[PDB]
């Protein structure tokens, strides 16, 4: 949706978005920390995991038609 433009906007990343290994949000996930390029996901939830952004970063995707980033700091394996 129009949300894709929001993600692609900052995620000008040109790749093959495909949830290959959907990881589960660890209760120790980010619940307070929220960034413009971050997702408002909650700890203890499950979302689709895309490809690794840089080295230790997994981009989650929601059927909501919007994407979000997650730092390895607070995320599942």
Q: List the domain boundaries for the chain.
A: 1-77
Dihedral sign from CA coordinates of 43, 49, 50, 53? positive
DSSP code for 28: T
Closest by Cα among 45, 44, 34 to 70? 34
Does domain 1-77 correspond to CATH entry 3.40.630.10?
no
Give the whole-angstrom CA distance, residue 58 versus residue 75.
8
DSSP track, 50-69: EEESSSSEEEEEETTTEEEE
């Amino acid at each position: 949706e129009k949300e894709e433009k929001d993600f692609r906007k900052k995620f000008k990343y040109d790749g093959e978005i495909r949830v290959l290994y959907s990881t589960k949000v660890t209760t120790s996930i980010t619940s307070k920390k929220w960034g413009t390029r971050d997702l408002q996901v909650k700890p203890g939830e499950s979302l689709e995991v895309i490809q690794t952004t840089d080295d230790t970063k997994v981009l989650c995707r929601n059927e909501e038609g919007k994407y979000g980033y997650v730092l390895r700091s607070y995320l599942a394996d």
